[PDB]
């Protein structure tokens, strides 16, 4: 019994249990309380690791689906509160430790900074001179550009935003506590997938973009209209003045003189001065027209709100997703989607696999769309922000996708019920897993031979003094003619298949060379032989990662080698040295290998992005009109060999990282070496096995017993699974930190 509010249901499907778990601190001092195999306490050091390994494995703690659902819901509230703390921290550092107003007054002669370092042990050198007398660390997160597009002009608004973010974090934390301990919703409530979808479509995504269209129209658009006109930020009215004095809007947008009447009478064209379809970019800032983005958010809101009405809830109108799914079956696929509604309404891991896959794919789509259609003012000219945002979203997407593989496998081991999947899509997938995987295997072999092998052919031909026998734009050509054709279609579209659009959706497809200040923001990104070869590298590495994770899911129950793999679990090291050796058959080990292959794929993607943008897009433009690129168009002739990537990309561009000592970039050289060290360190865990280390520990325990200093909690070597987890965690950390230091030194040292 804690706080007891009235009730708060209004003929709703809301159903809760009051006070199921009392608030108490005792279990805080009882570590491992949630696991029966842990509650008694430790006896060996393994006990510690598993305590962290199983902390969020809510299935393994309780068999009750309702309690698992409640734990998940409150954990989501806690995670949202963490994200709120982080975002308010960003806004606070923008308010109190940034040069934001100074940057806003003159964004072409000052570098954004929002982290000041204290002077100690010499590290004060990291406070590089970023312009206007400001000294700090140059940020590449694009926070300043977002804040300018939103219409921030003052430190006090950022400070108020940070305070609101802290209050929101407190609210989320209290909601998590409240819905686990005070009013915990029943399993019947979570399974209302139709209502949840209606609300997340019309309410979360639809009303979200509607309110943001409101802010963009009333705050972002007039304020940026005045900012780009050269008006000093202090002379611009505050956001609320345009709402108190509507004549300001009306003189910035004459349609406002007519008000809301054109909206309700379907006379929308009157609004054509602030709801636009310009395309292209803003000539002053290099970003997307904010009016275009406001019209975009308005249309997206209408779309999502309409979508939020498909599913039936309390009123007979709408769809049952179970019915729809059951109706989709064909002569090739047995019972079709029968059973999918029951799977996705009783299995958290199935939902999480779907959602991880789609959210990772979306994060990648975000990187790809934001680089070529730069949405924020002055982001495209800031090549460091451009590179950093692209690569960051890439990595997040890749990790989410690999997690999707993990949770497909966990579904197969823990929630798949064969009596509920008789001759449906999942069952037939299991029943021809061999065809699927043997073919994916062969496609990967073909894609590797005919992508990487082309590079090896070129390296060997060039070394043999035989340039005319290479795959290149000047020899044996591999032109990507379909991508060229679609680029041409996009360039012709404003005048034919997109009449009411003035410019292209993106200048990468072709057209003018948009440059702000002396640097190009965007220009046609042409595609040739090297681009063909690297796109097939991408297809190859993606296919191999998919091969690994899909094999992990489809064989998690069994294989010809191990027909009872399901009984062994999702996470386990092997089934012994027998059958020739069965190490790494688990779904967890497939995730473990897919991590490395995803890292490979994304490393190549981001290297391709960096080199192609530095060679053929980015650069400085003379007042005569001509363009001079950062790496002088070297991609076409150098990216067609492995030696070209080793010398003209890695070797040439690493000069900034390795010479960073003695300047504000010194920390990037430090972390370059740091990533290298962590990568090398991971090889100890990956190339060895725990038996050797357990024996070494035996000798060291003898040393301790000799002086009567051996611990009661006996030291054990890491488990096989944990050895692999540590190895891969360190491999990814070291390699990614290496590339991060490299990229930041490079993109910050190239104008």
């Amino acid at each position: 019994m804690t706080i007891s509010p009235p009730e708060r249901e209004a003929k709703a499907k809301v159903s809760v249990d009051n006070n199921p778990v009392p608030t108490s601190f005792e279990k805080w001092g009882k570590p491992g309380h949630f696991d029966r195999t842990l509650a008694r306490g430790p006896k060996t050091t393994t006990w510690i690791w598993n305590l962290h390994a199983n902390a969020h494995d809510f299935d393994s703690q309780t068999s009750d689906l309702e309690d698992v659902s409640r734990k998940i819901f409150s954990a989501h509230f806690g995670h949202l509160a963490v994200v709120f703390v982080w975002l308010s921290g960003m806004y606070f550092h923008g308010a109190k430790f940034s040069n934001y107003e100074g940057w806003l007054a003159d964004p072409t002669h000052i570098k954004p900074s929002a982290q000041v370092v204290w002077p100690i042990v010499g590290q004060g050198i990291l406070n590089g001179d970023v312009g206007g007398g400001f000294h700090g660390i140059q940020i590449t997160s694009g926070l300043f550009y977002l804040w300018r597009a939103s219409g921030f002009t003052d430190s006090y608004q950022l400070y108020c935003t940070a305070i609101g973010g802290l209050v929101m974090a407190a609210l989320m934390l209290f909601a998590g506590w409240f819905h686990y301990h005070v009013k915990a919703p029943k399993l019947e409530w979570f399974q209302n997938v139709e209502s949840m979808m209606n609300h997340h479509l019309a309410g979360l995504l639809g009303l979200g973009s509607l309110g943001w269209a409101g802010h963009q129209i009333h705050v972002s658009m007039p304020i940026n209209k005045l900012l780009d006109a050269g008006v000093a930020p202090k002379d611009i009215p505050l956001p609320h003045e345009f709402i108190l004095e509507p004549s300001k809007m009306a003189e910035l947008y004459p349609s406002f003189a007519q008000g809301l009447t054109p909206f309700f009478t379907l006379n929308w064209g009157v609004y054509s001065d602030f709801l636009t379809f310009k395309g292209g970019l803003n000539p002053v800032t290099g970003g997307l027209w904010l009016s275009d983005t406001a019209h975009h958010h308005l249309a997206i809101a209408v779309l999502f709100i309409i979508a939020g009405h498909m599913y039936r809830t309390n009123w007979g109108i709408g769809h049952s997703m179970k019915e729809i799914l059951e109706a989709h079956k064909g002569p090739f696929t047995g019972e079709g989607h029968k059973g999918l509604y029951e799977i996705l309404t009783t299995s958290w891991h199935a939902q999480l696999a779907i959602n991880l896959a789609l959210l990772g794919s979306l994060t990648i789509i975000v990187a790809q769309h934001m680089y070529a259609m730069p949405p924020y003012p002055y982001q495209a000219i800031d090549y460091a922000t451009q590179l950093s945002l692209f690569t960051h979203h890439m990595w997040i997407g890749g990790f989410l996708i690999v997690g999707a593989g993990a949770h497909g496998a966990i579904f197969m081991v823990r929630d798949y019920d064969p009596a509920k999947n008789v001759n449906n899509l999942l069952d037939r997938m299991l029943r021809h897993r061999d065809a699927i995987i043997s073919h994916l295997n062969w496609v990967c072999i073909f894609l590797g031979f005919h992508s990487f092998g082309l590079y090896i052919h070129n390296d060997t031909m060039r070394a043999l003094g035989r340039p005319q026998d290479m795959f290149s734009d000047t020899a044996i050509q591999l032109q990507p003619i379909f991508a060229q054709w679609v680029q041409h279609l996009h360039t012709l579209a404003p005048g034919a298949t997109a009449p009411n659009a003035l410019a292209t959706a993106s200048y990468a497809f072709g057209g003018e060379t948009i440059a702000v200040a002396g640097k190009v923001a965007m220009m046609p990104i042409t595609l040739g032989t090297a681009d063909f070869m690297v796109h097939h590298i991408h297809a190859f590495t993606i296919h191999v990662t998919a091969l690994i994770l899909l094999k992990g899911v489809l064989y998690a129950r069994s294989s010809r080698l191990v027909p009872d793999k399901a009984n062994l679990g999702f996470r386990f090291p092997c089934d012994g040295p027998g059958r020739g050796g069965t190490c790494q058959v688990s779904g967890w080990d497939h995730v473990f290998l897919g991590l490395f292959w995803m890292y490979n794929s994304l490393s190549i993607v981001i290297f391709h992005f960096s080199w192609k943008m530095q060679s053929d897009v980015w650069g400085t433009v003379s007042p005569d009109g001509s363009v001079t690129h950062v790496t002088l168009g070297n991609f076409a002739q150098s990216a067609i060999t492995i030696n070209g990537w080793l010398r003209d990309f890695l070797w040439a561009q690493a000069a900034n990282v390795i010479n960073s000592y003695g300047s504000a970039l010194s920390a990037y050289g430090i972390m370059f070496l740091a990533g290298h060290f962590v990568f090398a360190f991971s090889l100890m865990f990956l190339f060895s096995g725990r038996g050797y280390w357990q024996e070494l520990i035996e000798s060291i325990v003898w040393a301790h017993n000799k002086l009567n200093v051996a611990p009661a909690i006996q030291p054990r070597a890491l488990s096989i699974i944990q050895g692999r987890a540590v190895g891969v965690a360190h491999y990814l950390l070291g390699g990614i930190v290496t590339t991060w230091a490299f990229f930041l030194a490079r993109s910050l040292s190239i104008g």
């Binding site: 842990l38 006896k43 060996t44 393994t46 006990w47 386990f572 090291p573 006996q714 096989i720 699974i721």
Partner: protein, 69 residues
């Protein structure tokens, strides 16, 4: 010759507790090869990979236990 509560040191060589000390829990009847049951404060390695602890009891013969107490 052993009794419940006797502290003994293990002498089996191949045993995990050779040189370590355990306590006698029970003594089984004659005709059995390893009648003396000993318990230990330190578990052995017994268990599948990743198991929290191990086995802390084992049977021995009198010639394999050395009375300490």
């Amino acid at each position: 010759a052993l009794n419940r509560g006797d502290k003994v040191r293990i002498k089996r060589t191949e045993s995990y507790w050779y040189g370590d000390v355990g306590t006698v829990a029970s003594v089984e009847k004659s005709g059995i090869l390893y009648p003396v049951i000993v318990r230990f404060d330190r578990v052995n390695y017994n268990g599948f990979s990743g198991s929290a602890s191990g086995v802390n009891t084992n049977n021995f013969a009198e010639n394999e236990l050395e009375l300490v107490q």
